[PDB]
Ligand binder design. Sequence first.
Ligand SMILES: O=c1ccn([C@@H]2O[C@H](COP(=O)(O)OP(=O)(O)OP(=O)(O)O)[C@@H](O)[C@H]2O)c(=O)[nH]1
Length: 321
Amino acid sequence: ACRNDIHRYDATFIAIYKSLIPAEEELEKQRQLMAHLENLVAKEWPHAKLYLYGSCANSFGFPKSDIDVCLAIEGDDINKSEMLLKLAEILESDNLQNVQALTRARVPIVKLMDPVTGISCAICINNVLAVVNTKLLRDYAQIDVRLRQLAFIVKHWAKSRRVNETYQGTLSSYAYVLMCIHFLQQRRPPILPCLQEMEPTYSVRVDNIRCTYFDNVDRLRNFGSNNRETIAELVWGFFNYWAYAHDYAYNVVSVRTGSILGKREKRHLICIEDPFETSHDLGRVVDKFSIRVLREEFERAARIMHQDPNPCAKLLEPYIP
Ligand SMILES: O=c1ccn([C@@H]2O[C@H](COP(=O)(O)OP(=O)(O)OP(=O)(O)O)[C@@H](O)[C@H]2O)c(=O)[nH]1
């Protein structure tokens, strides 16, 4: 069963959606900065490639002036420290402000702040697998608009309800997009395909991990065109799965497969399998306490999406400790 008036809230959810997406003027400043930093890095390393990654490149990012950049370069004696310090002075002689050398769990990072656009940028060497990660989600976001629409709704819900911190036992935004992709894959008729179970047209390799899938996604623009579910059906339907339908004891959600894999075949309380790094359970951060808070927020989200006379504002009302 579902609401008889569910489509009355399609209007608001998309209005919420297109407000959460970054403005074009903001993204114009990003491409202009990136085109400048690509040409600048290429002057020192003609064989290096700059790739964006993270929220600023998978097309599932909220508005902000911080971008992440992976400097891809090939070789064997690749020392990222000596490169990033040489790169640090090329930024400083380019009149870029606040060129800082930083570390995150010992990975060398350098950060800059562009005076032209006010955008910040964090640069690291050879984080290539994270680049292919965002390429997949960007490729998936091109197939159906409802993926972007649903994922922006859920990500806003996780932040408003204070369940978007892995350091507090909840799930990252990368995990939430995987749950949305997998939810839209299991709807019948399908909204999203399983790119990795298709004829390969893209195949790379990052340290004995071969990422291979079909990435001619503009050939798929009409894939989910036989599924008439609106976003108020999906948003309601998403939280309904994770509150009542997900078999938390035996099930794995698998974008890599587009189906439900068995969990018993091997701390995992909610299993979200990474599409390429398949041993990386994105729910390993959850513990026996935070799983209860997650499922309580799932059950809260479902009843609101099923009963509340104004669910679009009730679903996202902030959580106050
Ligand atoms: O376990 C992970 C998590 C994340 N990532 C990589 O980091 C990216 C997302 O990482 P985040 O979960 O930190 O997204 P975000 O906080 O920056 O987004 P906002 O809610 O702030 O808007 C993803 O694009 C992924 O490639 C991994 O590689 N492994």
